[PDB]
Amino acid sequence: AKLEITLKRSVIGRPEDQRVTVRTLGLKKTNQTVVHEDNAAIRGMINKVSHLVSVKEQ
Amino acid sequence: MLLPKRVKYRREHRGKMRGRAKGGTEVHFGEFGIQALEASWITNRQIEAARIAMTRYMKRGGKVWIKIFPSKPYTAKPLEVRMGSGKGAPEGWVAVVKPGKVLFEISGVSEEVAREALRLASHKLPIKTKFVKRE
Amino acid sequence: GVGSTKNGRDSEAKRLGAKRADGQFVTGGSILYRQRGTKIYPGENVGRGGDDTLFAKIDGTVKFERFGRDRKKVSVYPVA
RNA sequence: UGGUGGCGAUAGCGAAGAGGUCACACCCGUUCCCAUACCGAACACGGAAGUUAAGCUCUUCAGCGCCGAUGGUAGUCGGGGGUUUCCCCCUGUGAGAGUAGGACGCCGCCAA
RNA sequence: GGGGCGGUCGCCUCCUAAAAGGUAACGGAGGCGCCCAAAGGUUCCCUCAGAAUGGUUGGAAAUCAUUCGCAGAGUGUAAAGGCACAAGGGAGCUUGACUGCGAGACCUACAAGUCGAGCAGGGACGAAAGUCGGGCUUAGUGAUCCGGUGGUUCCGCAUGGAAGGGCCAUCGCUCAACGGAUAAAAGCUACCCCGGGGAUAACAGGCUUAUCUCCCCCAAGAGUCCACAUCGACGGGGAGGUUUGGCACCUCGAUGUCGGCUCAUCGCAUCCUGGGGCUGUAGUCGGUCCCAAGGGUUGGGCUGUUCGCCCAUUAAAGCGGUACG
RNA sequence: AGUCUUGGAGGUAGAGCACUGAUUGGACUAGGGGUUACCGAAUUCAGUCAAACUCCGAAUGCCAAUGACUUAUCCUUGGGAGUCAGACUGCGAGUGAUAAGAUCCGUAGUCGAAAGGGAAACAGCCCAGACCGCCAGCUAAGGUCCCAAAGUAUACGUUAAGUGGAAAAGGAUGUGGAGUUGCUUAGACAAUCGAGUGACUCUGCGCCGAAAAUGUACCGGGGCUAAACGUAUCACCGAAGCUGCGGACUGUUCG
RNA sequence: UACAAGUAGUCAGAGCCCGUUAACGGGUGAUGGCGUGCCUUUUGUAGAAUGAACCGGCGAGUUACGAUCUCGUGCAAGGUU
Numbered sequence A: 001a002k003l004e005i006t007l008k009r010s011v012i013g014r015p016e017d018q019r020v021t022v023r024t025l026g027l028k029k030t031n032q033t034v035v036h037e038d039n040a041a042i043r044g045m046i047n048k049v050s051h052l053v054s055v056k057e058q
Numbered sequence B: 001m002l003l004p005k006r007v008k009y010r011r012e013h014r015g016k017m018r019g020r021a022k023g024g025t026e027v028h029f030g031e032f033g034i035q036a037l038e039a040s041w042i043t044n045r046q047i048e049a050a051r052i053a054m055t056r057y058m059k060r061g062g063k064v065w066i067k068i069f070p071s072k073p074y075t076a077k078p079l080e081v082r083m084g085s086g087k088g089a090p091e092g093w094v095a096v097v098k099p100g101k102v103l104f105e106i107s108g109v110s111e112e113v114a115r116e117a118l119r120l121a122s123h124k125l126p127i128k129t130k131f132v133k134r135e
Numbered sequence C: 001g002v003g004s005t006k007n008g009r010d011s012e013a014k015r016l017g018a019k020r021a022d023g024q025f026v027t028g029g030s031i032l033y034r035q036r037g038t039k040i041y042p043g044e045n046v047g048r049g050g051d052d053t054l055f056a057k058i059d060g061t062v063k064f065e066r067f068g069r070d071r072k073k074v075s076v077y078p079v080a
Numbered sequence D: 001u002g003g004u005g006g007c008g009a010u011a012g013c014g015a016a017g018a019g020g021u022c023a024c025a026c027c028c029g030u031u032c033c034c035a036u037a038c039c040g041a042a043c044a045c046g047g048a049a050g051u052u053a054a055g056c057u058c059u060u061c062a063g064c065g066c067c068g069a070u071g072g073u074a075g076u077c078g079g080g081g082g083u084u085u086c087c088c089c090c091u092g093u094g095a096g097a098g099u100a101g102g103a104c105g106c107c108g109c110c111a112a
Numbered sequence E: 001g002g003g004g005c006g007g008u009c010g011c012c013u014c015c016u017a018a019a020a021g022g023u024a025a026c027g028g029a030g031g032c033g034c035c036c037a038a039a040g041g042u043u044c045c046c047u048c049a050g051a052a053u054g055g056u057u058g059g060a061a062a063u064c065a066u067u068c069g070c071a072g073a074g075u076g077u078a079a080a081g082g083c084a085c086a087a088g089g090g091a092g093c094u095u096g097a098c099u100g101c102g103a104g105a106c107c108u109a110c111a112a113g114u115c116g117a118g119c120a121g122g123g124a125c126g127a128a129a130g131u132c133g134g135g136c137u138u139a140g141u142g143a144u145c146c147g148g149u150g151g152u153u154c155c156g157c158a159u160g161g162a163a164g165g166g167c168c169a170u171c172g173c174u175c176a177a178c179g180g181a182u183a184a185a186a187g188c189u190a191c192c193c194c195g196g197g198g199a200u201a202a203c204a205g206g207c208u209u210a211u212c213u214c215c216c217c218c219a220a221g222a223g224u225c226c227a228c229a230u231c232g233a234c235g236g237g238g239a240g241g242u243u244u245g246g247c248a249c250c251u252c253g254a255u256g257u258c259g260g261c262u263c264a265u266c267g268c269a270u271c272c273u274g275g276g277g278c279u280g281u282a283g284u285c286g287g288u289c290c291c292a293a294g295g296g297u298u299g300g301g302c303u304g305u306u307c308g309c310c311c312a313u314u315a316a317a318g319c320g321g322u323a324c325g
Numbered sequence F: 001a002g003u004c005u006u007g008g009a010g011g012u013a014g015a016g017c018a019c020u021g022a023u024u025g026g027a028c029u030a031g032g033g034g035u036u037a038c039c040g041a042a043u044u045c046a047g048u049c050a051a052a053c054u055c056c057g058a059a060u061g062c063c064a065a066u067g068a069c070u071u072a073u074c075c076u077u078g079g080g081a082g083u084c085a086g087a088c089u090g091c092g093a094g095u096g097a098u099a100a101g102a103u104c105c106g107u108a109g110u111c112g113a114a115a116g117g118g119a120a121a122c123a124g125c126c127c128a129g130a131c132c133g134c135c136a137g138c139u140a141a142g143g144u145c146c147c148a149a150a151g152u153a154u155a156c157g158u159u160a161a162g163u164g165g166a167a168a169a170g171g172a173u174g175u176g177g178a179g180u181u182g183c184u185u186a187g188a189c190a191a192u193c194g195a196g197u198g199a200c201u202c203u204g205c206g207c208c209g210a211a212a213a214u215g216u217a218c219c220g221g222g223g224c225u226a227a228a229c230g231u232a233u234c235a236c237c238g239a240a241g242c243u244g245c246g247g248a249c250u251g252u253u254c255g
Numbered sequence G: 001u002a003c004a005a006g007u008a009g010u011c012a013g014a015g016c017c018c019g020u021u022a023a024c025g026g027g028u029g030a031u032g033g034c035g036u037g038c039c040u041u042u043u044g045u046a047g048a049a050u051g052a053a054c055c056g057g058c059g060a061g062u063u064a065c066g067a068u069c070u071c072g073u074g075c076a077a078g079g080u081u
């Protein structure tokens, strides 16, 4: 399966560790969407920045 | 006036008063008691005023357990000094009271007498309280 | 007017504690743990220095292990 | 049974019984090797008159000690809110205490 | 937390320190500038505090003896971390409290600091295995320059020597302001000067409100009786922002500072006058609280004064804010 | 480098009383005092508390390992710097009075060096990072009666205080929702009569307590009984965010 | 342009007057929205901190000799006076 992760909220005003996780998903811009494989690694990243991102199963 | 016979350190940190009381949340010894609803330092002066108030109302007619002990020292700097140049001298003694702590307990009187005795004591204290019974 | 404090002294912090991780490869002589006394004991292929420093005797993998009921030890096991 | 290892007192302590011919002990000698801030107590070296009393071995016991969940609660990472010495809510995590329960040894190797 | 004065300055241990490490304050506690020729090394052996019970001196406490006894002792010394297969106690023999070093680590701006298996030389103890490069661990120290002493297959200003230097070892620092400006150093300035700072004080503002002023809660009591006419102990809660302070945010290429004079203006916690409730209000007077800011609210003596005391008035001689207008 | 997985070091939060201190009551008493509980240390049972207590002990953070998924950093050497006054906000502490827009650390953010929208105005709060153009579009925080863009939206409740739109102990038949309980048509309660009434606990929203100085002056204003508060739902407005269209430049990879 | 509250502009915008390097032109500007100069120094300045009356001119990392690094060129185990 593939997840479709969108950066809903800005990384401005957020802890460095959250900003790095957002950036590591390939999200460089607010409202940008990236497609990743559904697995425990990507799900664990989503969990850390769940308040910043919107996810939907592709 | 309650104070320790001795202490290990005369100058302690003020600490913090998060959370409910660790122990003494129920009326253990007596029949009735007065429970803290709010966190505060209770000075030994406040305990004594509270103790005499309830004791006088009962007319030698019942026993009182003071469940809090003012173990903690607090300091103050002399009047009209600048900041720094070391910690202040010990001034007084406080008990740290958190929500749930039963402060005083009464036995050997009616509920009517106990309620009024503990009401009179409550007005000496800097916290909201409630009357409680042993379950 | 003001008095003075009789305190204000401290020693230099000595950077004690673990210097290599469990599972990490170490060369012979690598300090594994600095300590006062034996908070951790020398296990297999680990020596205790004059100031209680635990060090690897061999090249190998570090393993912090339980030593009986209360105590701990650190060992180095050869890679194979 | 004796020796000698490994394993967190789940191995311990305590209590009550049982068992010795060989083996292990206690035991009986101090002439010699050796010995005690004094003593063959111990450590040594020698013996086998008799004893399972003790150690040791095997059973029974949860009184103490030990091990110990589940659930709940405290705390708390992250995200919010409020009346902000503090408090509350949400996804997650999660003790200590208490308790169910476990447990009066488990796994070697050698000799007889 | 302006400067002065006081205190402090390097090193070790703990706490603060937010369960790696590190982490500040004129934060909270203590130590160090050594000691030991065994209190070091090794081999072998051992177990402590205290209590109970019994004992001529002898007692709670000397010395036995018995049982109990995770340490409730000890570990040269501060503390922490350790330590009873002891790192604690005892005894024998010793000098490894060794020389050359050192894979590799830790720590770290640098300078330094720390740990180290292992190799060689020659030893100590041990039957051997082995352990030993001081001490249970972590303080007990000080760069360079210069000079002294000992050693030396080094250099030696034509050459041989020497003088002197080098190298190795070691000594001389409360250089303690302890990374040590010099081998060698105290004060006054209101006769002062320059460069700077609102990085930093004195004025006023601001924040704060301990203190201050005012208002409350509880009601033990006082009040002949009677808590609440009036007053209100022990305690508790606020408001104000006029006091004394705290802080150092604006201003040091200048924000003039006390008192008075002139001119006021605002708040009301009301001094007078107006209207009231309660009264321990007979009346006349008063007390206390409520409403009320319209207007009013003195001339002198002393003192720079504000303030205060005094004289004599007045219906009254209000209290505060306005850069202490 | 992030995340997952796995292992580890460590003693905070919490908790606990096993040690060290502090400490409450009872039981029972050495012993010392007026033969006595006359008072008693230890002991024993229960009970409190701790930055410098710990039989315990998290969340996190930290150090690694192995793959995986993702990301593009990282290291070394050399040339050139600047910086060594920081600020506030949230959280964890000290100092202080658990005062300060105070001070001093830890940690994250923003400001500094960051314009845009919101918070009336307002470096540091909330939202969000401005290459340039557009009389396009969708959103964020915050909003939608008028100033002022968008709901005088919908549904069900609450408040009568302009609470909302400063302030505590304490005081009170305010009012809404729960629950417990006494008494009562064998006639309660109020003053014979005729249906209820009178205590308490928890809880929502209000009330008093509430006095400052140029002028309403403690919603930005008007004004509001909702245009307030709570719960739920859907529209819409709203930024220099994102998208669209056009242009410029830089980098990477293959115009 | 004499009912107006102004860091003086900016964007929106009628009306009136013009007519160009001919451009989805020029001048003026009722009215609407937004908007606290520049510099320095600062944690932070519209600042009630500093500096400048205005305009013009003049007015501040240079050169020499050494060193070092990068780049370039010549030659290269040599190079160069």
Ligand SMILES: O=C(N[C@H](CO)[C@H](O)c1ccc([N+](=O)[O-])cc1)C(Cl)Cl
Pocket (backbone or CB within 6 Å): E202, E203, E254, E255, E256, E257
């Ligand atoms: O020094 C002066 N005034 C300064 C501002 O420059 C300030 O107003 C001030 C006044 C008085 C004061 N005091 O009395 O201590 C202190 C500062 C000048 Cl007016 Cl002389």
Ligand SMILES: [K+]
Pocket (backbone or CB within 6 Å): B082, E001, E247, E248
């Ligand atoms: K100060």
Ligand SMILES: [K+]
Pocket (backbone or CB within 6 Å): none
């Ligand atoms: K010896």
Ligand SMILES: [K+]
Pocket (backbone or CB within 6 Å): E177
């Ligand atoms: K110095």
Ligand SMILES: [K+]
Pocket (backbone or CB within 6 Å): E203, E204, E323
């Ligand atoms: K002034």
Ligand SMILES: [K+]
Pocket (backbone or CB within 6 Å): E215, E216, E238
């Ligand atoms: K009041």
Ligand SMILES: [K+]
Pocket (backbone or CB within 6 Å): E251, E252
């Ligand atoms: K000045």
Ligand SMILES: [K+]
Pocket (backbone or CB within 6 Å): E293, E294
């Ligand atoms: K008046």
Ligand SMILES: [K+]
Pocket (backbone or CB within 6 Å): none
């Ligand atoms: K902070």
Ligand SMILES: [K+]
Pocket (backbone or CB within 6 Å): F162, F165
């Ligand atoms: K209002």
Ligand SMILES: [K+]
Pocket (backbone or CB within 6 Å): none
């Ligand atoms: K305009």
Ligand SMILES: [K+]
Pocket (backbone or CB within 6 Å): G049
């Ligand atoms: K000035």
Ligand SMILES: [Mg+2]
Pocket (backbone or CB within 6 Å): C011, C012, C013, C014
């Ligand atoms: Mg330390």
Ligand SMILES: [Mg+2]
Pocket (backbone or CB within 6 Å): C050
């Ligand atoms: Mg040593």
Ligand SMILES: [Mg+2]
Pocket (backbone or CB within 6 Å): none
């Ligand atoms: Mg001095």
Ligand SMILES: [Mg+2]
Pocket (backbone or CB within 6 Å): none
């Ligand atoms: Mg930490």
